[PDB]
Amino acid sequence: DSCIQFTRHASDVLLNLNRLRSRDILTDVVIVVSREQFRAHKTVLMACSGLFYSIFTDQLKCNLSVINLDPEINPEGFCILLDFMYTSRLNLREGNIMAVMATAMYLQMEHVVDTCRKFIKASE
Amino acid sequence: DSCIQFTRHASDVLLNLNRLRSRDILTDVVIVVSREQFRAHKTVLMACSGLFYSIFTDQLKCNLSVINLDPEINPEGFCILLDFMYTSRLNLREGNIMAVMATAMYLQMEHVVDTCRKFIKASE
């Protein structure tokens, strides 16, 4: 086509989706990770995670308002990844890298798994 | 913070939101523009448009599944802008620029209004 493109559009959309999340506006699911709960938008979760894409395209699970993650999933690891989904920013630290990588593998977030593997290999 | 950032994340999220829209997955509103209907995600509309941000933060309108636009709004103009919202690509042409600009003014999409004004000024 003969379209023009607004460079910052995708980033501005994501910034606004994060603002809606912070104000709990039109959030439609709560992700339970052991004793912790995280409110989010199903569409954003599906757009970032192979696991959520599978869950919310399921004819029964698409209608659930609560999703319980595997008890082995670390809440801080999940929190860091949920923040990444809404911002493109990953708070990767020596103290959380193992939990972040395990959570990214479970959530099926290949690019996060890739940078975790690379950061781990550099430290060995 | 000490975060790392994935450059393509925002663009990949938007590409997936557009794929969900094309397959009518978790779309939660229909925008009626005279004889035409457009299915979309309320969160994406709010993230792109001052008008939709106002509508869906309203305590009564947030729950509506159908929104009827002003009868002066051109469906093709709306279609071009809805595509822009989900892709960052604006199909701006001599034959549609007036309708696109009027629709962008109504929807409160300042960056689109700005490029339309500039393209119009260049042709006079």
Binding site: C3, I4, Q5, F6, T7 | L90, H111
Partner: peptide, 4 residues
């Protein structure tokens, strides 16, 4: 705005 750019030519993509």
């Amino acid at each position: 705005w750019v030519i993509p």
